[PDB]
């Protein structure tokens, strides 16, 4: 009834069930669906009603209605909007939002009239692709292909103005928790901070600090090891001693304050630690005087006592710790939580608690598209209400009437969401600089693996310029949640991370059932318990708010786990943690937690019996899925901070069984340890043998590999579309690749790689590519480039039009050839367009005409594939032209293995020149033997061995990381069984001379992938081209015919050479040369009319003593810019 020695198929059966039900882009879709179904409604309803005044007006928004996406044309007729139409026409895949409004007008006539404005349109929310609201939801593959969408396309991206935008999950410190940190040299020794948000209902966060004021005293009060706890409240300019804060809540007696702070007075150490804080506040002894003490230190002290007291009470109740409560009588709960913070602080001060780890991932929450679009939507709805209230108020002074449809500006919601998703700056347009940037990037569609990696990405908001190493290091808590390998090199290393395969981000659940169950199933609330009984009882936290105490904690955890396993009161994404050593229990239903599914271990055996695998093997025509497996109490989601109280077995067959015992209390087991690796790192064959940096380099390189990025590339007119000719699925595969759909959309091809030093053209990292293979279609690719042009009417008589310019009708012209354009100004497909040739004929009627047609990029020489005409959003004519250029692999192109072995094609020998085996297998790619040994990439070698054994045998070998049944010796024996050397070597013959090579070369079929970096997209030459308008120096860039930069390090190098003349040529003659006339009496440049030869210097009436100075135009601009700052840089030549 168990799974021994059959485990390898069982774990992969359950993993396949997971990825069949959940999918790879589930976090995005679920976050957005929760946003639309729940967050939008909650935000609109929770917004305060509009109250206007004299008659009274009340406006209330009741319920939302998000329709499916539609496109309102010029005529205004609704029409369903397929996503491909959004991409092609540069539209926005958005769906309108209607809200029912009730307007109650009170005219003081004892009869108020209620008018209902039904289904009021207020904006258009962009709809995530393949969300529950997309028109692509629930459609079969045939239906999607009828809609020209690729069934493999994950979804999870919005479409804004035609582009595809992916919302990156943004990290944030976990709110509603107490974290005790220690600053390095601050005036505070230990600081407990709590970021408090009222169930994300309102406000971003209103944090609270409780610090301990170092060791240095305040003159005559601190004479011990460091004391005087102080509290930094929100909206208070300076710090407030904590005892004053406690007394401000109505707890006058120091015994009551201590009871809230210290839970057992039988521990004198904590009392000795808190006594000087009491001594500080001995002076203040009443509630009102304490509130005044707080208030007088606020943003602006009140003139009178009453105003100061009211402001202090408002700060204490509303903003200081709002998650515990914001409704009046909640002062006792706030006192208990503030005492908890001080108690954590005192624990850290005495040393009984570890200071909370900074980068501990249980302290981090990921905002997916749900919370982020909620954060923007709350602001935009606040703005819509503000504008409607402004309109009503300015219309009610007249006292005539008021209309909601006129008053509501739909542009607010529509354009705010559109801008935030498009530009990436998260917030209002007016506050772009203060806004977060880098969220909502463009979904890169070079390779399928790149699309998946972009849809599953996490972004630490910390600035990339930080020099501190700690926030970039791989924390231990990332195990199974974030790929240990995938992280971009450069200054964004460790801060842009990618999800592990099994990671799921909690979507959110309202914690009403958990509170109800706890109240019904024993538990004592903080109001109805004597403070002396709290020392020996556990503290139950739900979403961080302290809900009460419990006497029998073990039974509570057992019962709660039972409920979560059977999924009745507790949903599967809710985490429950029992901090045993600290007598705490934390239950989290908060959205943003990162969890992974782990098998449940009871006693010393899995709950995953043979029946479950039996029903999953019959997954079809049995309606057994992952959700049935989870609902049967077999698998359980474990988030990062419950993983601390979980003892995990890596594999069952080796750890559960009795041996010399290491741990006999396992609580969960891992499905397969290969799910720690993320999407782009799971393509690595035998990754456990490589050096880890090589795995990171491959993770970076796989997104840059080349292949069929989506099966409907024919319909999508996208810029920079590389499509490989003959992709091949790897012969040394990893099982994870079955779920990334890498077999269906391969990016690469298997090459008979020889690790040999043939002619020295493979030295350093370069490779020698067989010219004959590249001749027969090896690694050949197509480079589709799309050009978009838009007719427009800008001025009154200023009109753009697509029409072929005649030789003499347009004043502005270029030396290009216009003969390829048809009557419509658009080249028909099939026309072989070379560089500088005109693509889309276009001209503007000047107030006769001025050409604005689109040329090609330099040195492309492509052939037109597809030319499309439509109407854009504004109804003008819109053209998109795609040119394909077959890019045969030449000797500048870049090729990379699946192990970080990268290199340019050094030279392309022909087949006869290539070395050959006794059979006739000449290597397609020869890589350098020197690449391997230092960087210790061994997945490459074992992958060549496994490729040879697999190609001979006929199956596709398994390269799953931790398999323990695929050793090198096993592969070697299987290879020797086929007539080859066990180590993969082969006796090779020199193609030039015919002789055997005295050293046997290691030849094997290795999966090599072509990269987007091609030399024809990197080669630039400059000789007297264009200049900038301002600097009069060569432009910036390859596209602008610009010039290479002679930076400061170059001039330092030249000075070291002692090369004055070459330095002068580079920084004077090669760049901007200029001549100015300078007066001799004053160094200020002089007016110089050269044709009249009348050189005059106003300011001294000088006309004869003038000298010509050759200086760079940059120096002339520097001098004039100084002169506009009143500095006079006189250039005296005497």
């Amino acid at each position: 009834e168990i799974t021994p020695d059959l485990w390898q198929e069982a774990c992969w059966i359950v993993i396949s069930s997971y990825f069949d039900e959940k999918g790879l882009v589930r976090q995005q879709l679920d976050s957005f669906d929760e946003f639309i179904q729940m967050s939008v409604q909650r935000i609109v309803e929770d917004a305060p009603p509009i109250d206007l005044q004299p008659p009274r007006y009340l406006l209330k928004f009741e319920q939302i209605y998000l329709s499916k996406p539609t496109h309102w044309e010029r005529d205004g007729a609704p029409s369903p909007m397929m996503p491909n139409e959004a991409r092609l026409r540069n539209l926005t895949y958005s769906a309108p939002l209607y809200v029912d409004i009730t307007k109650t007008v009170i005219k003081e006539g004892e009869e108020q009239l209620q008018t209902q404005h039904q289904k009021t349109f207020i904006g258009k929310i962009p709809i995530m692709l393949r969300s529950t609201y997309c028109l692509l939801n629930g459609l079969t593959d045939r239906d999607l292909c009828e809609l020209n969408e690729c069934p493999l396309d994950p979804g999870g991206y919005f479409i804004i103005n035609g582009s595809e935008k992916v919302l990156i999950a943004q990290e944030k410190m976990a709110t509603n928790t107490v974290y005790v940190f220690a600053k390095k040299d601050s005036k505070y020794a230990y600081t407990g901070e709590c970021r408090s948000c009222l169930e994300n209902s309102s406000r971003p966060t209103s944090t609270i600090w409780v610090s301990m004021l170092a060791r240095g005293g305040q003159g005559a009060k601190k004479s011990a090891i460091g004391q005087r706890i102080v509290a930094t409240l929100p909206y208070i300019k300076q710090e407030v001693p904590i005892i004053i804060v406690f007394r401000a809540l109505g707890f006058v007696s120091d015994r009551d304050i201590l009871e809230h702070i210290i839970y057992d007075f039988e521990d004198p150490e904590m009392m000795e630690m808190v006594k000087p804080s009491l001594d500080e506040a001995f002076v203040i002894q009443e509630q009102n005087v304490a509130l005044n003490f707080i208030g007088s230190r606020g943003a602006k002290p009140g003139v009178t006592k009453e105003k100061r007291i009211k402001y202090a009470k408002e700060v204490l109740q509303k903003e200081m710790l709002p998650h515990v409560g914001v409704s009046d009588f909640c002062e006792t709960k706030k006192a208990y939580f503030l005492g908890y913070m001080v108690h954590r602080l005192l624990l850290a001060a005495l040393g009984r608690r570890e200071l909370d780890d900074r980068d501990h991932y249980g302290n981090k929450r990921l905002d997916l598209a749900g919370p982020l679009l909620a954060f923007l939507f709350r602001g935009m709805f606040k703005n819509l209400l503000k504008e409607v209230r402004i309109y009503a108020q300015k219309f009610i002074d007249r006292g005539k009437d008021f209309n909601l449809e006129l008053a509501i500006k739909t542009r607010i919601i529509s354009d705010g969401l559109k801008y935030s998703l498009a530009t990436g700056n998260w917030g209002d347009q007016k506050k772009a600089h203060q806004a977060r940037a880098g969220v909502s990037q463009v979904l890169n569609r070079l390779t399928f693996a790149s699309t998946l990696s972009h849809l599953r990405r996490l972004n630490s908001p910390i600035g990339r310029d930080g020099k501190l190493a700690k926030p970039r290091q791989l924390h231990n808590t990332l195990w199974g949640m974030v790929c240990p390998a995938e992280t971009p090199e450069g200054h964004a290393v460790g801060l842009v991370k990618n999800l592990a395969l099994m990671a799921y981000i909690s979507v959110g659940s309202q914690p009403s059932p958990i509170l109800e169950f706890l109240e019904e199933w024993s538990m004592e609330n903080l109001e109805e318990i004597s403070p002396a009984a709290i020392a020996d009882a556990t503290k139950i936290f739900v979403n961080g708010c302290w809900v009460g105490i419990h006497k029998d904690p073990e039974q509570l955890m057992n019962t709660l786990r039972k409920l979560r396993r059977q999924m009745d009161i507790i949903v599967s994404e809710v985490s429950m943690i029992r901090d045993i050593r600290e007598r705490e229990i934390r239950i989290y239903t908060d959205a943003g937690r990162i969890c992974r599914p782990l098998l449940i271990v009871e006693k010393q055996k899995l709950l995953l019996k043979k029946r479950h695998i039996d029903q999953l093997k019959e997954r079809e025509y049995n309606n057994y899925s992952w959700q049935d497996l989870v609902a049967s109490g077999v698998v359980e989601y474990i988030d990062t901070l419950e993983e601390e109280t979980v003892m995990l077995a890596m594999t069952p067959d080796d750890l559960q069984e009795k041996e010399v015992a290491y741990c006999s209390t396992y609580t969960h087991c891992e499905i397969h340890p290969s799910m720690i690796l993320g999407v782009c790192a799971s393509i690595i064959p035998f990754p456990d043998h490589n050096q880890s940096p090589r795995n990171t380099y491959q993770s970076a390189m796989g997104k840059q590999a080349m292949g069929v990025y989506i099966t409907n590339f024919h319909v999508r007119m996208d810029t920079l579309a590389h499509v490989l000719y003959y992709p091949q699925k790897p012969l040394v595969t990893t099982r994870s690749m079955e779920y990334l759909r890498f077999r269906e959309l391969p990016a690469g091809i298997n090459s008979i790689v020889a690790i040999a030093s043939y002619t020295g053209y493979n030295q350093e990292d370069s490779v020698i590519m067989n010219r004959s293979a590249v001749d027969r279609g090896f690694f050949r690719s197509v480079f589709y480039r799309s050009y978009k042009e838009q007719e427009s009417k800008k001025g009154f008589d200023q009109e753009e039009v697509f029409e072929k310019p005649t030789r003499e009708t347009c004043q502005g012209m270029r030396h290009a050839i216009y003969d390829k354009l048809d009557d419509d100004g658009l080249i028909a497909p099939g026309v072989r367009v070379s560089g500088d040739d005109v693509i889309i004929g276009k001209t503007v009627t000047l107030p006769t005409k001025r050409d604005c047609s689109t040329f090609l990029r330099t040195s492309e020489t492509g052939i037109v594939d597809q030319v499309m005409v439509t109407l854009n959003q504004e109804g003008y004519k819109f053209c998109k032209i795609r040119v394909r250029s077959v890019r045969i692999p030449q000797i500048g192109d870049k090729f990379a293995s699946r192990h970080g072995q990268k290199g340019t094609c050094g030279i392309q020998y022909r087949q006869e020149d290539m070395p050959f085996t006794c059979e006739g297998i000449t290597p397609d790619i020869i890589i350098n033997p020197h690449a391997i040994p230092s960087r210790m990439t061994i997945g490459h070698l074992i992958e060549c061995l496994q490729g040879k054994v697999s190609a001979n045998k006929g199956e596709i070998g398994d390269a799953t990381p931790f398999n323990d049944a695929v050793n090198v010796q096993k592969i070697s024996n299987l290879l020797s069984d086929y007539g080859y050397h066990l180590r993969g070597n082969e006796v090779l013959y020199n193609g030039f001379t015919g002789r055997k090579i005295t050293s046997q070369i290691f030849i094997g079929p290795t999966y090599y992938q072509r990269l987007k970096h091609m030399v024809d997209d990197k080669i630039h030459s400059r000789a007297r081209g264009p200049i900038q308008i301002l600097n009069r120096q060569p432009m910036e860039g390859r596209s602008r015919d610009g010039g290479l930069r002679f930076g400061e390090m170059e001039r330092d190098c030249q000075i070291a050479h002692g090369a004055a003349q070459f330095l002068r040529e580079r920084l004077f003659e090669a760049s901007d040369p200029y001549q100015v006339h300078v007066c001799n009496l004053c160094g200020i440049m002089a007016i110089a009319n050269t044709r009249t030869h009348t050189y005059e210097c106003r300011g001294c009436r000088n006309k004869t003593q003038i000298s010509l100075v050759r200086m760079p135009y940059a120096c002339k601009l520097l001098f004039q810019e100084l002169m506009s700052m009143s500095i006079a840089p006189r250039m005296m030549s005497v």
Binding site: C145, T711, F778, A951, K953, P1005
Partner: protein, 67 residues
């Protein structure tokens, strides 16, 4: 995407051996036996048929530009 005629490493035609490969695999044989029955002795040729992905079937599911 479509079956590469003329195996890259050596040159033997493996462009007519894909439909036969599919039929042979569908009927009885293991992949190695099907490759042998097609006379692909050299493992470079076997890497063509064995590791190919017939994306042209996915491409053909889409409607044409013109009927």
């Amino acid at each position: 995407m479509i079956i590469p005629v003329r195996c890259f490493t050596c040159g033997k035609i493996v462009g007519n051996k894909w439909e036969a490969y599919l039929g042979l695999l569908q009927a009885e044989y293991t992949e190695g036996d099907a490759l042998d029955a097609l006379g692909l002795k050299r493992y470079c040729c076997r890497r063509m048929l064995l590791a190919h992905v017939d994306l042209i079937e996915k491409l053909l599911n889409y409607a044409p530009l013109e009927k």
